[PDB]
Design a binder for this molecule. Structure first.
Ligand code: HSM
Ligand code: HG
Ligand code: ZN
Length: 257
């Protein structure tokens, strides 16, 4: 079944999901000297004030925090986007050591983790229909560096104990995603895909330039999660990241100079 190990890892995904070798795959390396300023890009608009978090779940490849997306409560607009995209879920990718763990890299630099806020374009009515369109989704990606503790992430850290293994879920309401945003909203944008199967090339990537800092202690609780289900041998959930894919015909744009 796909995973991140040696026999079912990213190097093998292509056998079940042939699009893994397509033309707009993701994570990519963001070469900062080849990324071009685009003055025509608008500032991003993040309206997360009415967000309703509902649950936190260990799906066997990451942990997801899920939001109510049946009304326009947590939405992203502006930037490189046409229309409103509603927040559906956020999740992270991390490493087994602090020097690796992000999916996207900047000038070949890897960060300790990467947070992904997943949104679907509300012209398509539901997430299922948005993943059938070249513009169905917008993913906001944020780098995590090990430094000082991020107070807003602690509520997530303290709950991991209870979703340790695959299939477990916990109620997780009143979580505000605004506590996970850096101070600056400057970004790089390019057309790509989801970085886990089915690798659908449906995504407009919005990668924030400024990383947020997390404590070593916080990143360490992530590394305690398990890939396996309860009652199976213990495999810690670490290195759940896909390596950078060739950029091919894509131009990375910067919202800043
Ligand atoms: N296996 C599809 C579930 C999913 C969506 N996002 C993260 N995980
Ligand atoms: Hg698509
Ligand atoms: Zn992701």
């Amino acid at each position: 079944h796909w995973g991140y190990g040696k026999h079912n890892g990213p190097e093998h995904w292509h056998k079940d999901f042939p699009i893994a070798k397509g033309e707009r795959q993701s994570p990519v390396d963001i070469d900062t000297h080849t990324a071009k300023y685009d003055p025509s890009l608008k500032p991003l608009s993040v309206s997360y004030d009415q967000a309703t978090s509902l649950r936190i779940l260990n799906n066997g490849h990451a942990f997801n925090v899920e939001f109510d997306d049946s009304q326009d409560k947590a939405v992203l607009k502006g930037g490189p986007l046409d229309g409103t995209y509603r927040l559906i879920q956020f999740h992270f990718h991390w490493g087994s050591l602090d020097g690796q763990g992000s999916e996207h890299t900047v000038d070949k630099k890897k960060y300790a983790a990467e947070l992904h806020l997943v949104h679907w374009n509300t012209k398509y009515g539901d997430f299922g229909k948005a993943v059938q369109q070249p513009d169905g989704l917008a993913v906001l990606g944020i780098f995590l560096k090990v430094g000082s503790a991020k107070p807003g992430l602690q509520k997530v850290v303290d709950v991991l104990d209870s979703i340790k293994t695959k299939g477990k879920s916990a109620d997780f309401t009143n979580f505000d995603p605004r506590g996970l945003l850096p101070e600056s909203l400057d970004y790089w944008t390019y057309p790509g895909s989801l970085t886990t199967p089915p690798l659908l090339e449906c995504v407009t990537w919005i990668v924030l330039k400024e990383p947020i800092s997390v404590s070593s202690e916080q990143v360490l609780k992530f590394r305690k999660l398990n890939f396996n289900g309860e009652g199976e041998p213990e495999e810690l959930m670490v290195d759940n990241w896909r390596p950078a894919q060739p950029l091919k015909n894509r131009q990375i744009k910067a919202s800043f100079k």
